[PDB]
């Protein structure tokens, strides 16, 4: 009975050199939930991100504005549009777009969200064509 | 399997015994051996193995 | 319109390898035979999706 087409075999050879007594509680250890943090907005005056939306950032707001329009069909176009990307895309060059980027950027150990909410509406938009 | 040789005398160290010996340890030892807490040696003895879900052995091999 | 430049024409043996786009072409829609295992779906235009 020749069987053939056999499974191989597998090897593995390298290093991983990953460079008061105690007892068990169930309290001071453990605690996968993690604390609830708090959301720090920075205040306007000391933004210091760029306030020209990024082509990711624009591109974003426009996708998730069409698929929101995709689901409800609320706009402030004053020239209607056969498609929601269209609607979406001018809500973004005519600066009614009612969505805003928060812009994280720290994670406090004290459980803190340092953010700085931008509005698209005042912000810089990128070339997108 | 393992073998635990007294100067010559040979026992297997089969794993209830082993258990029972990793059992022995507390956890200061595990600790101030770097050993995380949830690392203790107790837990490499298994009395109730997982059985898997459906999910990764479908089709009715490793069921076998 | 008659070319500028004299055209090089003549007779030269070609061969048809047999490579049909027919054979390679695959389209897939959105549904189709899945994986058990994974819930992907199955491999290459033999399953018929992939």
Redesign the interface.
Known sequence: LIMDDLVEEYVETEEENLVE????PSIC?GFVQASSQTLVIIPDNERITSNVLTTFEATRLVAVRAQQLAINGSTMLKKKYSSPIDIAKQELFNRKIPLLVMRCIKVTPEGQKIVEIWNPREMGIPLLD | TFWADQQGKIDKLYPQIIREIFSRVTYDTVVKLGRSKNSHPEKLVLKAIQIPPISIRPGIDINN | EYFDAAIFIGPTYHQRLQKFVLDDRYAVASYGPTDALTGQPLDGKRSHGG
């Not at chain 1, 007594?21 to 068990?24: D, K, L, N, Y």
Request: proline content about 0%; hydrophobic content about 40%.
């Open positions: 007594i105690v007892e068990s250890e």
